[PDB]
Amino acid sequence: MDQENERNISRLWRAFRTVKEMVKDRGYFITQEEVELPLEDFKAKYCDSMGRPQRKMMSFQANPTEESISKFPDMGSLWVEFCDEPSVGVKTMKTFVIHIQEKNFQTGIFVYQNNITPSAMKLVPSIPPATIETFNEAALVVNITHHELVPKHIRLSSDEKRELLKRYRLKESQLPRIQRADPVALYLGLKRGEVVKIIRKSETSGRYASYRICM
Amino acid sequence: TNSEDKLSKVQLYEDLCRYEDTLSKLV
Amino acid sequence: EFIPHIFYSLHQIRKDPNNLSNQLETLTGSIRHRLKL
Amino acid sequence: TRNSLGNVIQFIYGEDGMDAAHIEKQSLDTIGGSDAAFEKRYRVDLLNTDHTLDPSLLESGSEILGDLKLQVLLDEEYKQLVKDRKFLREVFVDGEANWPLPVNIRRIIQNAQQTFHIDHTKPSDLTIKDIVLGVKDLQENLLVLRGKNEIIQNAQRDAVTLFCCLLRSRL
Amino acid sequence: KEKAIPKDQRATTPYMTKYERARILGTRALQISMNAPVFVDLEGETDPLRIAMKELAEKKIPLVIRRYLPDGSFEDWSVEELIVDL
Amino acid sequence: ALLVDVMTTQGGLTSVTRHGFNRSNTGALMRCSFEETVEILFEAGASAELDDCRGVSENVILGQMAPIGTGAFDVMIDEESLVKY
Numbered sequence: 001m002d003q004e005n006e007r008n009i010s011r012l013w014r015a016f017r018t019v020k021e022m023v024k025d026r027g028y029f030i031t032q033e034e035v036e037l038p039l040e041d042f043k044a045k046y047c048d049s050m051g052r053p054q055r056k057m058m059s060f061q062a063n064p065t066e067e068s069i070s071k072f073p074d075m076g077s078l079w080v081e082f083c084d085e086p087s088v089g090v091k092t093m094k095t096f097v098i099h100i101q102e103k104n105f106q107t108g109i110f111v112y113q114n115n116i117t118p119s120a121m122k123l124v125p126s127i128p129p130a131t132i133e134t135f136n137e138a139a140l141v142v143n144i145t146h147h148e149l150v151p152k153h154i155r156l157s158s159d160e161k162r163e164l165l166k167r168y169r170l171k172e173s174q175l176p177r178i179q180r181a182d183p184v185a186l187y188l189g190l191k192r193g194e195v196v197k198i199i200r201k202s203e204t205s206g207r208y209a210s211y212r213i214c215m
Numbered sequence: 216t217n218s219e220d221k222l223s224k225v226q227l228y229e230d231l232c233r234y235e236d237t238l239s240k241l242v
Numbered sequence: 243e244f245i246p247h248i249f250y251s252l253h254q255i256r257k258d259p260n261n262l263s264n265q266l267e268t269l270t271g272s273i274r275h276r277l278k279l
Numbered sequence: 280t281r282n283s284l285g286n287v288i289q290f291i292y293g294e295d296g297m298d299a300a301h302i303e304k305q306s307l308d309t310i311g312g313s314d315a316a317f318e319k320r321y322r323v324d325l326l327n328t329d330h331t332l333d334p335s336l337l338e339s340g341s342e343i344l345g346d347l348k349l350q351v352l353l354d355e356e357y358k359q360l361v362k363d364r365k366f367l368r369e370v371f372v373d374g375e376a377n378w379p380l381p382v383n384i385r386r387i388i389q390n391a392q393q394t395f396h397i398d399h400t401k402p403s404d405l406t407i408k409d410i411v412l413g414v415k416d417l418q419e420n421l422l423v424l425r426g427k428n429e430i431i432q433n434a435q436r437d438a439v440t441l442f443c444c445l446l447r448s449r450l
Numbered sequence: 451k452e453k454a455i456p457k458d459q460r461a462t463t464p465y466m467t468k469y470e471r472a473r474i475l476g477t478r479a480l481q482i483s484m485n486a487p488v489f490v491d492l493e494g495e496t497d498p499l500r501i502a503m504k505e506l507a508e509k510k511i512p513l514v515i516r517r518y519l520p521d522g523s524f525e526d527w528s529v530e531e532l533i534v535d536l
Numbered sequence: 537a538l539l540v541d542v543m544t545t546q547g548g549l550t551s552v553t554r555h556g557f558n559r560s561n562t563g564a565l566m567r568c569s570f571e572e573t574v575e576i577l578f579e580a581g582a583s584a585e586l587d588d589c590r591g592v593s594e595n596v597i598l599g600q601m602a603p604i605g606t607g608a609f610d611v612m613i614d615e616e617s618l619v620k621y
Contacts, residue, residue, distance in 0.1 A: 167430050169521045174286040177547040201370050203378060205295040206440040209433070215547060238277055242270055247342070264335060271338045271402040278404075280538070283562060283591035285520055288541050425461050469605045477611055489621060512617040516610040518603075528614055 005051055012053050013042050015140040019080065019111065022187055025145065027068035028078065055082035061105075071157055076106035086114045093120035097127060107131045107189075111140070133189065144183050151200040153184060156211075161195045164211065178212040190214040244276040251276075295438045296423045303383055306376045309360065309448050310367045321360050325350045338402040352411050363444050380442060384449045414450050418443050453523040462517055462525050466532035470515055474529060478502040478511055506534070566593045 017035065024030040046054050059081035068075055081096060093116075100108045112134060124132045144150065156164070165172065178185060178196060190196060191214065198210040222228055251273050259266070280289040293299075309317075324330035325344055334340030343349060368374070391397075421442070424435040482488065482498035489510045495501055505511050509530050517525045543550055550556040558567045558576065564587045568576040579585075587594065595602035 163428075164430065167426070167428055168287075168290075169519070169523075170285075170287070174281075174284070176287070176545045179547045182547070202294045204293055204297075204441070205438050206366070206370055206444070207437050208291075208294045209437060210290060212547075235277060238273065242274060268335050268340070268402060271404075272341055275338045275404070281520060283566070283588075286545070288545060289538065293537065425463070427461070470609065473606045473609070473611060510621075512614050512621070514612045514614045516612055518609060524610075526612075528617070530617065 001051070009043065009047070009051070009053055010039065011141055012055075012137075013039050014142070015111070015137055016042070016058065018140045018143045019109070019135070021143055021145075023062050023078065023080065023109075025187070026078075026189060027064055027072070027075065028062040029065045030062065055084050058082050078107050078109065079103060079105045080109040080111070083110065083112050088112050088116045088120050090117060090119045093123055097123055097132070100130060100132070101127055105130065107133070109133060109135065111135050111137060113137050131189075131191075133186075135186075145187060150184065151198050153188065154197045154199070155188060155190070156195045156197055164195070172213060175211060175213045177215045179215065185214060244279060247276055248273060291424075291434065291438060295441075297381055301381050302379045303381075304377050305380045305383065305385075305445060307367060307378065307445055307448060308376070309364045309444070310371065310374060310376050317364070322357055323353050325353070335402060338404045339406070340402070343407070349407050352407065356411060359447065363447060367444060378441075380445060382442075384446070388449075410450075414447070418446065455523060455525050460525055460527075462527070464531075464533055466515075466527075466529075466534050470532070471534065474511060474513060474515075475499065475502050475506070477513070478505065563587045563589070563591050563594055565597055566591045569593050 017037075020030055020035050024035065043051075046058060048054055059079070062078045062080070064072070064075045064077075079100060081099075083092065085092060088110075093110075096108075096110060107130060110132060114137075116134065121134070124134075172193075175195070178190075180186075180190075180192070185196075188196070194214045196212050196214065198212065200208050200210065202208045251269055255266075255269060280292050281287050312320075322330050323332060325332070325346060331344065332340060334344075337343065371378075418439075421439050422435070423438050424431050426432070426435075479498040479502045482501055488501060488505070489512070490501070490505050490508055492501060492504075495504070502511075506529075511529045513529045515527050515529065515532070517527065519525065543552065550560075554570075554572050558570075558572055560567070564576065564580040564585050568574075568580075580587075589595065589598065590603075592602050592604065601607050
């Protein structure tokens with residue numbers, strides 16, 4: 001039992017928990033017990049006799065809650081799948097794309113270990129209206145949203161956006177803006193033209209609410 | 216306006232009045 | 243009801259003036275409260 | 280707060296909409312102190328001998344004791360104070376109490392004591408109902424934003440939160 | 451005339467700022483100094499600014515302030531109905 | 537708080553220099569007011585840029601009354617009260 005084995009196992013377990021937290025934060029249905037799964041059960045289930053982490057059995061499908069469907073009628077099921085290869089080949093990406101398309105899933109999460117070939121990512125935007133998003137493994141070990149300096153963000157519906165825009169009597173190009181590559185935007189999976197509300201603490205009033213638009 | 220005039224006409228109004236006055240003197 | 247309370251407070255005034263000034267002041271305040279209401 | 284093009288820089292100036300010259304340093308008394316001091320200072324109980332009001336303070340102190348509605352009101356007030364302590368400790372994790380805020384309540388109270396020649400050696404003619412309802416109504420009559428939809432209501436409560444906390448602390 | 455807000459839906463402060471006060475006093479002082487009629491009982495004063503203050507005290511200045519919202523709409527408030535602190 | 541909100545309102549860190557503010561979307565005369573006058577004028581001419589004359593600098597160049605404090609509103613005559621007297 002070389003130390004690198006359990007080091008990699010622990011980091012992979014951390015990434016799995018972080019991905020579960022992200023999927024829960026996107027409005028889906030995930031139990032609290034499943035989030036707090038101890039590493040012993042993780043080793044018992046997702047490791048072979050030799051201790052090799054069997055990533056391929058971790059792929060799972062998630063469905064939205066009642067509240068998320070009520071707020072977002074267009075929201076649909078999501079699929080997440082891990083890749084065992086150190087580098088993702090073109091054939092593997094094509095197989096994943098075909099699997100997502102035949103499952104008729106609106107969005108999917110593809111977590112890769114080290115690198116992806118350019119021809120593989122050539123196929124990312126080729127399946128409308130489905131959306132394919134990639135997350136490097138080394139960047140999901142620690143949950144960003146749990147920091148002290150990151151306030152709490154919320155997503156707004158079309159009706160809420162229209163009501164705010166009317167009440168403040170504004171055109172969408174005058175609100176403050178947030179980029180796409182912004183880490184919290186990737187976490188929440190915001191597309192172009194969506195408004196995110198921010199709740200923050202303040203020395204002068206206690207609580208304060210700001211708004212931003214994804215450009 | 217005539218209401219208060221009618222109220223002042225009945226004796227027990229004066230009774231409560233000087234009762235209040237007597238307690239004012241006592242205090 | 244203020245009538246029986248006025249009666250009773252009146253009687254412990256007239257029974258025990260030897261109470262310290264604190265009780266006398268408090269009880270007179272109580273009667274002033276009852277007649278105010 | 281906007282600019283020449285119309286872009287919003289702040290949705291409210293200063294997050295509370297106050298002038299910079301109407302603000303003085305005041306201390307929030309709920310944050311600091313041990314739980315025993317807090318309980319002794321702010322808790323009043325009409326059924327337990329430990330935390331009753333001395334009847335020499337209130338003019339109607341004799342009759343109020345043992346009532347039911349009054350203790351319900353006092354319980355609501357104490358729950359509000361507890362929630363305020365939790366929130367204020369959430370905001371200022373350092374535990375500091377002195378912050379700048381509008382209106383010097385201490386000087387207003389001192390002026391009320393000096394002008395009316397209040398003598399502390401006599402019972403007062405106040406009523407618990409009157410005190411609680413008056414404080415709540417005064418909170419109801421503090422306005423910075425005068426919209427009518429729910430958004431402006433939420434913005435205005437968010438603006439006046441901390442001042443309402445201090446006001447509850449002092450009165 | 452679409453910009454004008456109905457009187458019931460007025461959502462601006464009912465107090466008058468220091469800038470509005472200074473503008474109103476200046477306009478009234480200029481008009482008085484250009485021989486305009488005076489609406490109050492002048493008593494031994496010969497300064498247009500002081501007569502402007504006097505007219506403001508009894509709330510007799512016949513002027514209206516138009517307040518511009520950022521979009522372009524406006525809100526009309528008479529000088530009589532504006533609360534002035536003292 | 538205001539300075540910090542201005543510096544980080546465009547979704548990224550905008551420095552207080554010509555590269556951050558003089559490359560913004562504001563008016564041409566406003567931007568040419570300091571440190572890159574002639575080049576900004578050339579670029580505005582070549583791109584056919586439209587200025588709106590609402591900032592302070594544009595109303596200072598043209599000798600007019602900027603909407604600044606006392607200039608934020610209009611004074612108008614009420615006929616009803618005047619007739620009532």
